[PDB]
Nucleic acid binder design. Sequence first.
RNA 1: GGGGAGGUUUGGCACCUCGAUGUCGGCUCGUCGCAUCCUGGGGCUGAAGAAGGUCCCAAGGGUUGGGCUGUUCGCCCAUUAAAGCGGCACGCGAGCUGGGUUCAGAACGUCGUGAGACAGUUCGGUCUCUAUCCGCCACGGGCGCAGGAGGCUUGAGGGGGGCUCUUCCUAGUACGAGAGGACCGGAAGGGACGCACCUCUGGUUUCCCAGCUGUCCCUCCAGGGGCAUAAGCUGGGUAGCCAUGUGCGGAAGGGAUAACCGCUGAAAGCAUCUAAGCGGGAAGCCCGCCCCAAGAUGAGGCCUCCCACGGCGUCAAGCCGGUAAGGACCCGGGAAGACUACCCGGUGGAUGGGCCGGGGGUGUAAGCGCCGCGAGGCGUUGAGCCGACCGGUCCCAAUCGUCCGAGGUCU
RNA 2: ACCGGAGCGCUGUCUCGGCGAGGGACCCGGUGAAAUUGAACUGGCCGUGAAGAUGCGGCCUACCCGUGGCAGGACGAAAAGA
RNA 3: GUGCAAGAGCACUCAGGCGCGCGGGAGAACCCUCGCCAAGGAACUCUGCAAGUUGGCCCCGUAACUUCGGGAGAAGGGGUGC
RNA 4: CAGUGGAGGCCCGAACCGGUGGGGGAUGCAAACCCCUCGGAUGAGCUGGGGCUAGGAGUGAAAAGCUAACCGAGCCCGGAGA
RNA 5: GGUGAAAAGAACCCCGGGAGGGGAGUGAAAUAGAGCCUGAAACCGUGGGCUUACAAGCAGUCACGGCCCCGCAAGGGGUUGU
Lengths: 205, 59, 138, 122, 117
Amino acid sequence: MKGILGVKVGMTRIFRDDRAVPVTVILAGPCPVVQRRTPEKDGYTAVQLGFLPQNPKRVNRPLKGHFAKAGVEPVRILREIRDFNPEGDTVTVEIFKPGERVDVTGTSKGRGFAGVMKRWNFAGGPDSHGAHKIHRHPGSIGNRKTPGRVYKGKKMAGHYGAERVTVMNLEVVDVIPEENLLLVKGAVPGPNGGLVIVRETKKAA
Amino acid sequence: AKHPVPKKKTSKARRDARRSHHALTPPTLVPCPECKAMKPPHTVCPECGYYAGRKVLEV
Amino acid sequence: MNRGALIKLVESRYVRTDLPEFRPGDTVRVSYKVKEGNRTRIQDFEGIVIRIRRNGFNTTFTVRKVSYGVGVERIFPLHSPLIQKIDIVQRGRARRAKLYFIRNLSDREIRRKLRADRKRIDQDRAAERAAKEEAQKA
Amino acid sequence: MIQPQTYLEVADNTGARKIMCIRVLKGSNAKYATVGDVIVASVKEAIPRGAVKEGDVVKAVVVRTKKEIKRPDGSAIRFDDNAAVIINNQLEPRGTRVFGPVARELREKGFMKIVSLAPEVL
Amino acid sequence: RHLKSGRKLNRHSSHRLALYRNQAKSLLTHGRITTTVPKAKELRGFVDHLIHLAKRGDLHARRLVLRDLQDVKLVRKLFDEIAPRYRDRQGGYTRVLKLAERRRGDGAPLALVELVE
RNA sequence: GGGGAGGUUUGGCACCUCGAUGUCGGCUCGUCGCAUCCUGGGGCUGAAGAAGGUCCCAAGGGUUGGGCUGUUCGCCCAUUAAAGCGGCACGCGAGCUGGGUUCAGAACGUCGUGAGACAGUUCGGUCUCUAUCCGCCACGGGCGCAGGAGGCUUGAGGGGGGCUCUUCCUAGUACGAGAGGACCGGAAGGGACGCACCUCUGGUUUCCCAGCUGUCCCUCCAGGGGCAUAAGCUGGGUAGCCAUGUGCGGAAGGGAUAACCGCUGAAAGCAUCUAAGCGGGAAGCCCGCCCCAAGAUGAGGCCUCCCACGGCGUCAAGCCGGUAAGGACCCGGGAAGACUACCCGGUGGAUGGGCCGGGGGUGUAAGCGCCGCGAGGCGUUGAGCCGACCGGUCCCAAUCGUCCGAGGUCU
RNA sequence: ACCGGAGCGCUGUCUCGGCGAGGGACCCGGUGAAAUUGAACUGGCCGUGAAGAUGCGGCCUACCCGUGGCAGGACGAAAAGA
RNA sequence: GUGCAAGAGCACUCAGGCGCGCGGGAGAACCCUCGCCAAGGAACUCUGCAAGUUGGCCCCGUAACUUCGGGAGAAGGGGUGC
RNA sequence: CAGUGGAGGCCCGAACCGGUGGGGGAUGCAAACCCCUCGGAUGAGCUGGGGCUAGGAGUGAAAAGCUAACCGAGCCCGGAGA
RNA sequence: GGUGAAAAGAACCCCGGGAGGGGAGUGAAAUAGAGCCUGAAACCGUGGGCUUACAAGCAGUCACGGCCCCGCAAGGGGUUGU
């Protein structure tokens, strides 16, 4: 029921314990509280967090510099963490000692048009024997004159990549609050240089 | 002259729809600095120029 | 929050610099181990070495080392549980930083192709008890 | 990565040199065996003046892969081949004199007589 | 996923070199040169690097400029007027910029390179 | 001995298609049925226990790999929790195969004097690139949303997802002569599958470095040069992309229930799960996790930012030429990408080419000394060259500028 | 270079695929065609009917036009059934 | 012409002679042609189709069978530069 | 036995003549083409030039094949508006 | 196969590289401008009137309604929301 923003840093292997660890590190960044959300006036429960302060002339207009507390804008907008309500402060990492697995929600790298082969993982055919014609084709679809049609959501030759992906449950290896680091078990969607948020997971009760 | 074969005459309307997306688009322009001419944006007009003074050779 | 490298190198607490010099020549002696139901062991793994894949941080090597029946190639990580690991007979003239071709045909032609660098020994003898002069002044 | 149809030798006094591998003995479609793993096997040839005759379908505990298996210690280690030891249907070494190095991964499968005999545990 | 590394393209290794080296050759030959926009950009990169190496006059660097170009004559012109002028103008010595129309007869964006001292 | 169900078998009829409905098997993609192959809940037992037996309930998930045959089927092989059956033009040829099948050749048997022939057989045998409409996977443009513009969003309604095994412990106790060998709960590890990433593992990297022969060329020698693929050959290989690699997901838990088992309780002085009344109880069901998503014309809500005829329409709706917040064009590129869109940077600027440092690769170069007639060796040295990764830099390319834009219905 | 069965070496034939290169495919300028074509304002489901429906009933779904792409169908075109 | 056992073979190239009567960008799937690959080696498949290893020349070295000619390059290894 | 000589519908293999197997091509480069592999390659060989035999007739190391891009009887022409 | 009674078949200028137009001028007519009489049908297109962006259709017919134009009125026409 917790959360904080961040950005993708490394992926390495810290020789913690005596076991190597593929470790995504995430610069969680000092993401300030701002325009809060209640269910009386909005209809849910969330908090707005802007990422990294880099904003002057090129920001312009409203600002929640207005809000009541300012801070201008980050450099790349703010996001809403559901079920969240701090206590009137800015937040970075400290709210998570190690031992606290969390889901990590981030954007995903884009593969443009994906061939059906490298999307839903198909065979394509034989490396000779038959015809070189198909070779890497999605085979056939539905039956003859009945169905009579094709299936809405049939695994097909289309797009794959520029998507939103939430990964689930990873041991928070350690927290560096002296800067802005949050190192957990390696995974995390997207490039080594794109936005990614942290949210507390669901396991026991 | 093979497998795929138009089964019927496409309607003049349909024609004009597939065409409704074409439209010979217009270009854009800007006036030449310290002269009267219309060069495209971020370009060096033949006779005119930038701040440096290159080319200029049209008779 | 730029200089991502710098960050990823700041979390590199592990500062294993207490390891001697090794190159695609040889390495020889010792490594570490686990074994027992609860840690405790130190097995000595020597041999003639092979690959050096470098990242400064992650960077690991692999060693040939041959046994009884046939040999084994062992990939060791340059930065923690390996304890002292410290080599013995260096040698080299690594006429190529890629000792794959020995994995194929190599027996007596192992030695015939793996030369030595007296140079390095001379250096070790220099830094030897010239470090006795640091046991005096500077 | 011993998969069904793979030739490989085995280091024993048992008197069986090279066997093929039938059905990896794990998942109902596992088909992939490494150290500590057990394969069904088909002896293609062996040492005549003795037992374990050529042809015997045998159980086999794998001890050597040519594609190094990972290690939690960061490291990883392989051999120059693919090999096993002939275990019986009670699961136990049908030899008594193993030959050369095998992996301590076997201890994570805990077959100590294979270990106590190994003249190069790694 | 690709062009994650990037590189201006078309043709092939043989013609990649050939076009780079020869457009560079004919470049310094005349000094100020018209061509197509992309070819222009990557070309100017290439010969730019070449000229920074030209900033020195040591045998190694010189022949290495001749690895790319050809005439030791053109390497005298290299290391006698041009390369000694940008003696204190370092990094970036190319003024390639666009042009009106496009090369009519195929419809293609135009550009042009300069000495730039 | 009887009566049905189903429409996959063998078939009866000859209604659609003879101005053509490409008839067998394999491949790839699947899906729907339940009469269930396995998993889950259980009743009956000639069920002690373990295992089994049959019958109820219940599709959510799963339903391996080889030998022999063109084979569907089927026998065997090693496994299995298990290796289900069936439909869908005996699924699928404008997706592949072309092994079977019935073209013209030839043959063996075989019938026939014969030409030829055979619900016999052997060998050989051209399967057509351009998707117009519906459909289906993805990406936009037009208007819309009954003020105008930027950011944040509720989830109407969907889509994915669902699995399973093995030992350890409780405990060699309960059961049982014994052999065997448990339920109840918990601990740990595995296989196949989906998901995202590149640190380690390993493959790729088309010019990043090293080596090598023929050859022709500068320029004689060292030194280099191009052809030898669309890199001439080999030895290597960062980023990026990748499974063999790495980390995760199924869950836990909530609600009514299926078969089945219980409470109270009459109708019917008794009894009864039931008629009103409850409780327990499935991998099923609605969820809770993952994602799309206000074109949910019902067009939502949150937060800020904006000026009131400007000259025509005099009433009642608007028309028009320029503004305000903004937005656009072009540009600079991009872990974004067919295009388009998406994002970020546009001199107030580190977006890109170049330069400098790190990291990485190759692994001591061109030259110079020295010994060797020389091949080369020795030093010069972990040197040279430097593709993408990390940053520092206004050195040079993102100049200048144009255009659009609310002028705030009504009850 | 004819038709079975076997083994040895070798290998992306396979497990089971991953990357790269070029020539297409994609966008821009110039040229620019074919067979087919009753008319088209052409959606699924469940029924129907000369027994296999966009068009008929019944219900549900569907803002107007494309571009890259996929072949279930339009009893797809081609061949007045061999 | 050079080089390779030799060669009208092959690579480069003399003299001579073309750049192929659309080009410019982008750097998606699927296609065409082409290269490389872990551990496994025919498990693929109607079938080792396909591709692969093997390849020149000299030397060493060669079975059943036979019409004595062949089988024979049998098969199995060595060397190759300067 | 040793030399010598140099026999052959002999062997490997260009030119040239073939056309196997896979692949591409399929309104093609093209009414049979191209790409990788292929059999012969002094013979019953390949070919230039001039000549001859033809429609129930030829020619045929033979398939009912070829006789001008469709040959179980050419082609145009007529009977013939069968 | 048709300019025209007649060649009177277009001097001059203008844009324009020419090609072809645009005033002038030729004739009853240039709506006779040179493959030109009379130019119908499909056929492409310039402008105007009506309606079209929550909808499922052999494309029409019945009626209602609105919008646009003649009509003295009362009536007519074209279009299409239901």
